[PDB]
Design a protein around this ligand. Sequence first.
Ligand SMILES: OC[C@H]1O[C@H](O)[C@@H](O)[C@@H](O)[C@@H]1O
Ligand SMILES: OC[C@H]1O[C@H](O)[C@@H](O)[C@@H](O)[C@@H]1O
Ligand SMILES: OC[C@H]1O[C@H](O)[C@@H](O)[C@@H](O)[C@@H]1O
Length: 362
Amino acid sequence: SLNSTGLAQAAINGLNARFYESSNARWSSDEPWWISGVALTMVIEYMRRSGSKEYLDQVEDVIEVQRQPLSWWPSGEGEFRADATDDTGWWALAMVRMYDLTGNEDYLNISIKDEAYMRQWWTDTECGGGLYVDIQDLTYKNAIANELYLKLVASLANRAPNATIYLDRAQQAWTWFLGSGMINGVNLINDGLARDSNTGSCYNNRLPVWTYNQGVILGALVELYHATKDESYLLSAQAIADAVLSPSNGLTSSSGVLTETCEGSDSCNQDQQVFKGVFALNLAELGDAVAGASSDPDAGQDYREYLDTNMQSMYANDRSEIVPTLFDSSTGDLYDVSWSGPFRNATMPKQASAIGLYVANI
Ligand SMILES: OC[C@H]1O[C@H](O)[C@@H](O)[C@@H](O)[C@@H]1O
Ligand SMILES: OC[C@H]1O[C@H](O)[C@@H](O)[C@@H](O)[C@@H]1O
Ligand SMILES: OC[C@H]1O[C@H](O)[C@@H](O)[C@@H](O)[C@@H]1O
């Protein structure tokens, strides 16, 4: 009796009432800019899955202003080309979804500019491949920038005119990622690569297993499946998702709820607060691809039940409503970080993550 389209809309209204800045065409300028890109993704995906165009004018406004040359990275020349490859990647994938929503080639073109910009920091000369996250310094090849890159080139292999260079890049990037060692012995992805002092060989740095690094990779593999019709991409994706769902690996509580490793210590910072909903949206993409590739009705049923289980927990334990007034009639729902633990306060990243979970259930 829970309607995920209605709750997604109420969560987007809450996001807007507390965090949207009209004069800036952005949410929460006091929060990292890439998380406005994630938020835009969630709003776009709500519209795609539900069929609403309620927020289209707002999204267009955000795109128009945020595509301008960034005051902190003018040499990027706008179009979301930023001072880190992952920041660019979040907006690039938002533009892929906006293209999917509208069919407007402008958004696809932006994604193509973003891919060419990110590729500049791919090297074969360290780690046999992959790109750096930190453009100014070039010290870290990490999971998230390389997952976003992979999902972007794979997305373009299905949509762009010069589709075969993107397919070759996606297949080579997946080959590199699989061979990097970041996917560990329980099929989960650690934070990134360290580099050996004497030898230049790279290895899994054993930094934490973050939920969004188990999620963006699933979307990439789903796009590789669509570009190739090779289910072995779905089989790898399902292995990573199945590891997340397994309570033995500690991302899934004994209540069956998705749980960031920092929640226990109450230490989730502004980045980590958004991670879970990015995983959920990507898990929904995997579940749709698996159910479509198979005649069995129970196909992808575990992923769908998982998202449902998480949705009901967040709805019941992690929710607070804006108090309407005589003057401001704004309504919506607000959310904290723990999809099981109690609501203490809302932040823009926490809210974006919550919207992601509802949209994953539409
Ligand atoms: O996305 C990260 C980005 O977010 C902030 O809004 C900006 O001030 C930048 O300095 C920073 O690099
Ligand atoms: O794994 C190596 C890596 O660890 C840190 O988390 C990063 O900030 C990088 O500067 C460094 O190269
Ligand atoms: O919050 C964790 C997050 O922190 C930084 O932004 C980078 O080191 C990422 O690789 C990492 O996932």
